[PDB]
Scaffold this active site. Structure first.
Site, PDB file in Angstrom:
ATOM      1  N   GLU A 136      -9.907  -8.969   3.449  1.00  0.00           N
ATOM      2  CA  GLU A 136      -8.499  -8.948   3.069  1.00  0.00           C
ATOM      3  C   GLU A 136      -8.032  -7.515   2.838  1.00  0.00           C
ATOM      4  OE1 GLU A 136      -7.383 -11.865   0.032  1.00  0.00           O
ATOM      5  OE2 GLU A 136      -5.797 -10.492  -0.612  1.00  0.00           O
ATOM      6  N   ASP A 193     -11.951  -8.465  -0.564  1.00  0.00           N
ATOM      7  CA  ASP A 193     -10.578  -7.968  -0.593  1.00  0.00           C
ATOM      8  C   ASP A 193     -10.616  -6.468  -0.849  1.00  0.00           C
ATOM      9  OD1 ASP A 193      -8.051  -7.039  -1.514  1.00  0.00           O
ATOM     10  OD2 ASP A 193      -7.466  -9.096  -1.992  1.00  0.00           O
ATOM     11  N   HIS A 201     -10.039  -3.781 -10.609  1.00  0.00           N
ATOM     12  CA  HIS A 201     -10.223  -5.107 -11.189  1.00  0.00           C
ATOM     13  C   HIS A 201     -11.516  -5.188 -11.988  1.00  0.00           C
ATOM     14  CE1 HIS A 201      -7.349  -7.879  -8.675  1.00  0.00           C
ATOM     15  NE2 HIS A 201      -6.714  -6.915  -9.321  1.00  0.00           N
ATOM     16  N   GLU A 215      -9.959 -13.805 -12.919  1.00  0.00           N
ATOM     17  CA  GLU A 215     -10.318 -14.708 -11.821  1.00  0.00           C
ATOM     18  C   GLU A 215     -11.431 -15.647 -12.245  1.00  0.00           C
ATOM     19  OE1 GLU A 215      -9.802 -13.317  -7.831  1.00  0.00           O
ATOM     20  OE2 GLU A 215      -7.879 -13.466  -8.895  1.00  0.00           O
ATOM     21  N   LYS A 241      -7.978 -19.643  -1.724  1.00  0.00           N
ATOM     22  CA  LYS A 241      -8.516 -18.603  -2.586  1.00  0.00           C
ATOM     23  C   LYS A 241      -7.980 -18.850  -3.994  1.00  0.00           C
ATOM     24  CE  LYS A 241      -8.491 -13.560  -3.178  1.00  0.00           C
ATOM     25  NZ  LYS A 241      -7.855 -12.288  -2.742  1.00  0.00           N
ATOM     26  N   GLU A 298     -12.678  -7.120  -4.731  1.00  0.00           N
ATOM     27  CA  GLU A 298     -13.385  -8.346  -5.078  1.00  0.00           C
ATOM     28  C   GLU A 298     -14.271  -8.895  -3.962  1.00  0.00           C
ATOM     29  OE1 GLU A 298     -10.845 -12.049  -5.109  1.00  0.00           O
ATOM     30  OE2 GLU A 298      -9.235 -10.573  -4.868  1.00  0.00           O
ATOM     31  N   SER A 313       7.691  -8.333 -10.912  1.00  0.00           N
ATOM     32  CA  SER A 313       9.020  -8.201 -11.499  1.00  0.00           C
ATOM     33  C   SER A 313       9.884  -7.266 -10.658  1.00  0.00           C
ATOM     34  CB  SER A 313       8.915  -7.662 -12.927  1.00  0.00           C
ATOM     35  OG  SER A 313      10.203  -7.523 -13.515  1.00  0.00           O
ATOM     36  N   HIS A 316      -3.938 -18.050  -5.021  1.00  0.00           N
ATOM     37  CA  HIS A 316      -3.502 -18.173  -6.403  1.00  0.00           C
ATOM     38  C   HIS A 316      -2.998 -16.801  -6.824  1.00  0.00           C
ATOM     39  CE1 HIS A 316      -7.679 -16.612  -7.952  1.00  0.00           C
ATOM     40  NE2 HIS A 316      -7.194 -15.888  -6.958  1.00  0.00           N
ATOM     41  N   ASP A 341      -2.688  -9.726   2.949  1.00  0.00           N
ATOM     42  CA  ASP A 341      -2.059 -10.111   1.684  1.00  0.00           C
ATOM     43  C   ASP A 341      -0.889  -9.192   1.361  1.00  0.00           C
ATOM     44  OD1 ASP A 341      -1.420 -10.895  -0.934  1.00  0.00           O
ATOM     45  OD2 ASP A 341      -3.010  -9.637  -1.787  1.00  0.00           O
ATOM     46  N   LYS A 372       1.082 -17.056  -0.771  1.00  0.00           N
ATOM     47  CA  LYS A 372       1.449 -17.110  -2.191  1.00  0.00           C
ATOM     48  C   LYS A 372       2.902 -17.572  -2.269  1.00  0.00           C
ATOM     49  CE  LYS A 372      -1.520 -13.221  -3.548  1.00  0.00           C
ATOM     50  NZ  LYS A 372      -1.552 -11.824  -4.040  1.00  0.00           N
TER      51      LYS A 372
END
Ligand SMILES: [Mg+2]
Ligand SMILES: [Mg+2]
Lengths: 430, 430
Positions: B289, B245, B158, B208, B392, B167, B41, B369, B316, B341
């Site tokens: 990543e 990542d 996460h 995920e 991914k 991850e 946002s 994603h 990323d 993305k």
């Protein structure tokens, strides 16, 4: 029109297990694709799904055999047939199978094609699936947006806590549209997570998108839910009502119901019916699924005579979406509601037959999902197309659940007042 | 090919939060529908998704404003235009917005329409989405099933454990086709559950669809995974490689990199570059990543000369899918792979541009994603249509993830040998 091709493949569900997905092609380029939810591979009460015992593939949960049935016989048997005629297409498939529980090709194969066929036909007639279903039912314009009972707290076999009730659900009965209902469920959903975190519990969703925190008792599960609805700015009973799936067969030992969430107390069939009754008094619980064991018919007759007038008694494992069983229950006054699982029966025709029978008997039909879902949202079009009035498709998390909610939004958006959200009035005993 | 109708709506994502979905109707009955994944946002680098901010609705996550943008200005400015020209459709939207980060209509509003448009055009040309894409890319022939780096064990922010890495993923490089690759993941996925289950670990899945057990270190995470792959009957390096990542942005402070999992400790950016170089020795980790903060460009320079030879450096948060940033990076020799993305850039045209610059520099593009997904499986057709070679899209759980895979299966079933599965060859650094 006429079926010119039928494709069948093997895809993965929401839990990582293979499943069937048909694809009926009609003359004119029209197509209808549908998948099948996870079902029972064993048992002598419901239509079974065929899975390959091949342990060198998906730990033995593959469905190449069922998929083969689709491409093989099923296809050649439906080729040339008029997809527009649903009852006919489902007939030439159930007969080819020969068996009653659809063991040859598998219910996960007949259903895949059955639905794909409907969608394909609906496309040829230039109309949504929910409109085509309504016609097949003989009630074209009769629509309605189903009141959803959303999974929120999981227990019993679906969790690792001191909660016996397999799942606690919430129903946005205060909503005026299914859209508003979905929003209310979303807000409560997120607020519950806040309450669970403050209690130092795990907020990791489950198979249905709901939470399975390690609560010390049934009361606590009901408490965290009550606190959530309030934090979300809603009032229990007025805006949201409570539904639940006891799955009593899980805690039915030696002719008695032992609840660990009650301090391992034992209850006789009659005692449990009164235990539930007492719950519906201290809490806005208006729907109870499988309040007793599927075999405890004598007990169900008693539970229905005591609760059936004010509380909805939904039979899930009790009827296994079977017309024979449900028919007997109606005559013996067993329950007053039935959970619809089209993959548990095999075809759309039979599923429609089950919904009609309940309606004629005064019973309520609750179109339900399965633990293993897919992107498919047919149950959404089915609920609206038959004006079931209620739906059970999970919590407000996981696309395999939310997909159905999004479909309802799209549907209500195109129907508006033609598909009203009756709220409470849909719940038996209300 | 002529746009006649364009409607937008507010739907729910896999996480229960609202998101935008758009429908592009073309003269002739052709219609395309697509939804945008959850993005950011705010931020001062990537495209900003527009949220209402009203505490009264969806806890301030409503997107009625972005939805209006689609139904109002955007639609009125696209009616009659040639939907067949993707670059033209996006330009009108981008220029109408009048901002860099598309903070007026919102990246989510524009993206939803941009993707729905492409899907509409594809149908108008009597061809699938992956075929329409390839053509728009200027390579109508090129096709390939991407190597899916399935998430399986999360850490850092996460999950509530002790693993610093955000991850850990597995890559079915030993597969001959994406279909088989998916089967491998499914199998590895299920076994890891038994490993955790037996270890008294929680098997609940995250957003995920992977696992968030309470591990004690990064080594243990790579332990249960390795133990899971072997138990599944597979050999690391040969059949299943590893990807991770780091997301160093979570533990980057004072110029150093802290690691709670490695006890209270931290080291220079140079040391961490070597720390990972050790993991790529003890374990078959071929993809890393964000192994450094997006600001540590100098550090990346070294890591690119330390691991950029045999290890894939996916950027990323570093590139945040932005040509202006990727370009400068290619010149300075930063990383050798970029996570794509489209909801992070705003449109399909701008997304293809990012992917093109990646291959034109040797860098590999990983169609990714977002945390909040939907039943939408566009990224699947995007990968193929662009022969990205890598994708991914989560683990083998939750339809919001497995929807992409099922679509991948459907595609490979249509293209056959036309869409090859290069395997480990796709991974930059082999
Ligand atoms: Mg049940
Ligand atoms: Mg990342």
């Amino acid at each position: 029109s006429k079926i010119v091709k039928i494709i069948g493949r093997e895809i993965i569900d929401s839990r990582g297990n293979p499943t069937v997905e048909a694809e009926v092609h009609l003359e004119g380029g029209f197509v209808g694709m549908a998948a099948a939810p996870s079902g029972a591979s064993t048992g002598s009460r419901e239509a079974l799904e065929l899975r390959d015992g091949d342990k060198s593939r998906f730990l033995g949960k593959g469905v190449t055999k069922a998929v083969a049935a689709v491409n093989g016989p099923i296809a050649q048997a439906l080729i040339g047939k008029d997809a527009k005629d649903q009852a006919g297409i489902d007939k030439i498939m159930i007969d080819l199978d020969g068996t009653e529980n659809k063991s040859k090709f598998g219910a996960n194969a007949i259903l895949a094609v059955s639905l794909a066929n409907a969608k394909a036909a609906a496309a040829a007639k230039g109309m949504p699936l929910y409109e085509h279903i309504a016609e097949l039912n003989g009630t074209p314009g009769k629509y309605s947006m189903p009141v959803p009972m959303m999974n929120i707290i999981n227990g019993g076999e679906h969790a690792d806590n001191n909660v016996d009730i397999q799942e606690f659900m919430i129903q946005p009965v205060g909503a005026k549209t299914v859209k508003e209902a979905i929003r209310m469920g979303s807000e409560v959903f997120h607020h519950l997570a806040k309450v669970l975190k403050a209690k130092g519990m795990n907020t990791a969703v489950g198979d249905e998108g709901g939470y399975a925190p390690n609560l010390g008792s049934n009361a606590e599960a009901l408490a965290v839910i009550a606190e959530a609805v309030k934090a979300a700015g809603y009032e229990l009973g007025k805006d949201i009502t409570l539904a639940m799936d006891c799955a009593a067969s899980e805690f039915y030992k030696d002719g008695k119901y032992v609840l660990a969430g009650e301090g391992n107390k034992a209850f006789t069939s009659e005692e449990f019916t009164h235990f539930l009754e007492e719950l519906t008094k201290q809490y806005p619980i208006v729907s109870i699924e499988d309040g007793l064991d599927e075999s405890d018919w004598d007990g169900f007759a008693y539970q229905t005579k005591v609760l059936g007038d004010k509380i909805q008694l939904v039979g899930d494992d009790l009827f296994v979406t079977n017309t024979k069983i449900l028919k007997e229950g109606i005559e013996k006054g067993i329950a007053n509601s039935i959970l619809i699982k089209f993959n548990q029966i095999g075809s759309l025709t039979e599923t429609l037959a089950a919904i009609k029978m309940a309606k004629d008997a005064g019973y309520t039909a609750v179109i339900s999902h399965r633990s293993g879902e897919t992107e498919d949202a047919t149950i959404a079009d089915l609920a609206v197309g038959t004006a079931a009035g209620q739906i059970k498709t999970g919590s407000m998390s996981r696309s395999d659940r939310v997909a159905k909610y999004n479909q309802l939004i799209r549907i209500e958006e195109a129907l508006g007042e033609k598909a009203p959200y009756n709220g409470r009035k849909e719940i038996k005993g209300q």
